[PDB]
Amino acid sequence: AAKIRRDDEVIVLTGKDKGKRGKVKNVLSSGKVIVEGINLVKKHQKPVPALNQPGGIVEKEAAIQVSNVAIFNAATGKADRVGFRFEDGKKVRFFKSNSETI
Amino acid sequence: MKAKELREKSVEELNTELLNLLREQFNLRMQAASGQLQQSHLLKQVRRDVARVKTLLNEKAGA
Amino acid sequence: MKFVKIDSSSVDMKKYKLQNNVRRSIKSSSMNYANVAIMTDADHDG
């Protein structure tokens, strides 16, 4: 019943990075997701003696709300909205505004 | 695995029931507690395998 | 997750209220009972 899922392509509706594009990383039951090289927060990390102890300041991919993002049509090359249909006998996804199979 | 284990002799699965315990279950409860076992997951499914068997055997025989 | 010890001051508090009300209430005339001897002299019933 979900629209975005484990692997897909998207673009930001609003926020810090608004107008920037990337694919999916992993989905969270919190209502959030992660994207590669979009949401970036400098973390001050502790040098754990176990294994390596780098400590230092590292950059990471922060979680983000779903409602602030939408798929990247990659035809008009901009935002577009999902709908659910039954193709053959199977539930699948399609675009609004130029309805097309995904 | 039910389907794989649904078709057998009541003793056959009863053998497998036992067999699980001789090696495996016991050992992992021993091998692991010492700290030598590097794989925990092997413990979960095994206990989950037994109950399936003991339910089958009770489904076939008796009630 | 980064909490400051535990502050049990509230323990000695509840013990103070409990201790104070217990005696102060049920101790009754012990100060006065003792005062009773004083009570029998300091009175001057006339």
Partner: protein, 93 residues
Amino acid sequence: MIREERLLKVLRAPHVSEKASTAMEKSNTIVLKVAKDATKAEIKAAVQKLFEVEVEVVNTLVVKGKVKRHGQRIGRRSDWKKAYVTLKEGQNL
């Protein structure tokens, strides 16, 4: 049968400590954890099978749990059982 079965449900893990190591090398005697019930005869049989070794004799006890405080909460460890087990001269472990 269930007889052999239960034996596999009795033992849990071997105990480890200095006192344990001494009886091993010195008295040829071993320690291991057991069930909350796990009587002597019940233990010895299992030892006679899986380890397939001789047994002088068995004696056991009960170990109480040690109260603890996590955060400000307080739990209690589960009372359990250990057994000092003895071996004849055909020993290996």
